[PDB]
Design a protein around this ligand. Structure first.
Ligand SMILES: [Mg+2]
Length: 375
């Protein structure tokens, strides 16, 4: 019978040592995010410069266009530039007024904010950085904001070799395969007055709207602060070990799937439900990971519901809604406890390391992190 606590938690050779990024990596991602923010704000200032020239000495559309083709918005297709120029021209005094006072704001979400960003494992796997841009509007164009953020990202891509722009449904994305990193930029709309009033010092989820790229619906009520709050709360409530086991389950997914698998947020939600309803010992994360693995299939089978009550879709669908994908996820889920149990009862440290590395991959190599269990 073996103990795997050091295998999991050691910050040098242990799994945690292999997943957490160094302060340098962490700062390179902050620098990249700062770059994206600066360019977004700059492109908005250029566009607003044009619009301000429109409010002032009213100019012709063909002139507006000529000015637009000189700003970083020149990194859009000639048709998109046409769209931008148009929307800026067709603007009424009011919309233009509101627009000239709009300055985009930013707030990061996902792993990087939760502090659960794992070093990518298999080739193709990358670091996900979601940095949302919030537009303080009342209650302006959807297309105009989408085009301005798009123009910011494409303008940054036109400056760097190996960078790519991908237009996804809930965001515009910048990929950097060579650096194994990618940054999504979802756009939200928030109430202006409440934003200013709170600034002179939390908004209301009911008024935080996520813009959708295509479809009949161009906005949906979605606040990331809900999930962030929920996880932070669950972290204080459960303990410092929740983030660790969440990182471990995510690493497990990253090791069992080169691409795909259950979302990290479903694994997190389930893991928190388990740690909330089952007794465990934080001074032994191997035992805890065994409990978690043991209760995960039963959690994913019943279905995992988002900690956001406004979310109508679940993080993971229940059993009677499972297709090949969810059945595959249930296959691996049900295969993990057998691996931890097998590894626990190995015949040597090296074989225990071999068996336990069947779940998280060959990342931990030091077999001395595994030790005999005390009576
Ligand atoms: Mg993302």
């Amino acid at each position: 019978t073996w103990n795997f606590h050091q295998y999991y938690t050691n910050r040098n050779d242990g799994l945690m040592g292999k997943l957490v990024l160094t302060d340098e990596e962490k700062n390179n991602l902050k620098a990249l995010r700062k770059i994206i923010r600066l360019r977004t704000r700059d492109v908005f200032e250029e566009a607003k410069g044009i619009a301000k020239a429109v409010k002032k000495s009213a100019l012709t559309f063909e002139i507006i266009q000529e000015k637009v083709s000189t700003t970083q918005i020149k990194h859009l297709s000639d048709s998109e530039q046409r769209e931008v120029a148009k929307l800026i021209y067709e603007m009424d005094d009011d919309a233009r007024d509101e627009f000239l006072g709009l300055t985009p704001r930013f707030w990061t979400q996902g792993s990087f904010q939760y502090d659960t960003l794992n070093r990518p494992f298999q080739p193709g796997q990358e670091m996900d950085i979601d940095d949302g841009t919030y537009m303080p509007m009342p209650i302006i164009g959807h297309s105009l904001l989408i085009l301005l953020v798009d123009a910011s990202l494409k303008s940054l891509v036109a400056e760097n070799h190996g960078w790519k722009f991908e237009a996804k449904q809930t965001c515009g994305r910048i990929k950097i395969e060579a650096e194994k990193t990618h940054i999504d930029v979802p756009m939200y709309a928030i109430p202006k007055d409440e934003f200013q009033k709170k600034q002179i010092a939390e908004l209301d989820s009911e008024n935080v709207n996520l813009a959708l790229r295509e479809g009949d619906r161009k906005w949906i009520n979605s606040d990331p602060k809900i999930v962030e709050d929920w996880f932070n709360d669950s972290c204080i409530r459960i303990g410092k070990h929740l983030r660790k086991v969440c990182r471990f389950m995510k690493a497990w997914r990253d090791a069992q799937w080169d691409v795909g698998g259950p979302s990290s947020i479903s694994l997190m939600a389930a893991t928190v439900n388990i740690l909330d309803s089952v007794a465990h010992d934080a001074s032994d994360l191997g035992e805890t990971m065994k409990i978690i693995a043991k209760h995960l299939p039963s959690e994913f089978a019943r279905g995992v519901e988002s900690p956001d009550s406004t979310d109508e879709k679940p993080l993971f669908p229940p059993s009677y809604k499972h297709g090949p994908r969810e059945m595959d996820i249930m296959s691996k889920l049900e295969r993990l406890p057998e691996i931890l149990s097998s590894a626990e009862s190995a015949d040597s440290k090296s074989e225990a390391l071999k068996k336990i590395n069947m779940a998280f991959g060959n990342r931990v190599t030091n077999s001395e992190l595994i030790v005999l269990a005390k009576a």
